[PDB]
């Protein structure tokens, strides 16, 4: 997250931190995710496509810090890793960038709700907030271009949803952005998601209810003028989500 605020997991209790265990036993941070039901985390296919081996991955819930333990945190393996079969990647754009992770503890248990672990509601069919709506993003991703390490403390920021019309303008993303994607950015280009925030939540208050409107997918640079964050439009993928869970 470029700009924004350091946060804590109780302010973002659906947030999932996903790591990969490497040959050699070192663990690196991969991407964010969102808990949509006790057994299911939702994220982005591009986070896993080059290493589709589910035993590699560690999922944490209730975690506020990248490399330190948080009181009440819970650790999970991936019982099932479901990548979207029509996923593809262009020079900038990623398509069908959505993934599901069925999680279980070593005891075989799914998430147990607490002050620091809760589910986030899915949107209803083809129902998104209006352009100009303020929404939040959360992640452990880069804070600055020059970062070579991710931040230790979880971060959040607030960005505004941008119309498909505006996002398709030639100095924006032209026809590379589609109606299955949502753009969001800071009017002053000061705050944005960035590398490492992919797969994490874009949360909007929709009918008074915290809703998972988007999943961090792509963008040219980070907080770059005329280059919004692009998010998987969760409301389009409900049939896919329903049929796979």
């Amino acid at each position: 997250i470029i700009g924004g605020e350091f946060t804590t997991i109780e302010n973002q209790p659906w947030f999932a931190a996903i790591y990969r265990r490497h040959r050699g036993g070192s663990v690196t941070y991969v991407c964010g995710g969102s808990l949509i039901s006790p057994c299911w985390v939702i994220s982005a296919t591009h986070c896993f496509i080059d290493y589709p081996k589910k035993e590699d991955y560690i999922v944490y819930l209730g975690r506020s810090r990248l490399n330190s333990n948080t009181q009440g945190e819970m650790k999970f393996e991936v019982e099932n890793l479901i990548l979207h079969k029509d996923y593809s990647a262009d020079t900038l754009a990623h398509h069908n960038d959505i993934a599901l992770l069925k999680i279980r503890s070593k005891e075989g248990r799914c998430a147990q709700p607490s002050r620091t672990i809760q589910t986030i509601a899915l949107p209803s069919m083809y129902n998104d907030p209006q352009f100009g709506t303020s929404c939040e993003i959360t992640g452990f991703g880069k804070e600055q271009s020059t970062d070579y390490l991710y931040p230790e403390q979880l971060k959040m920021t607030v960005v505004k949803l941008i119309s498909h019309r505006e996002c398709q303008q030639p100095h924006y993303y032209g026809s590379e952005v589609t109606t299955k994607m949502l753009c969001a950015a800071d009017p002053q280009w000061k705050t944005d998601s960035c590398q490492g925030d992919s797969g994490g939540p874009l949360v909007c208050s929709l009918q008074g209810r915290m809703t998972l409107t988007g999943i961090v997918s792509w963008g040219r640079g980070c907080a770059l003028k005329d280059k919004p964050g692009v998010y998987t439009r969760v409301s389009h993928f409900l049939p896919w989500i329903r049929s796979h869970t």
Partner: peptide, 14 residues
């Protein structure tokens, strides 16, 4: 080739 930033986490090409 593969771009940097969001989209290219956990990739050989990154």
């Amino acid at each position: 080739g593969x771009a940097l930033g969001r989209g290219c986490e956990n990739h050989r090409c990154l």
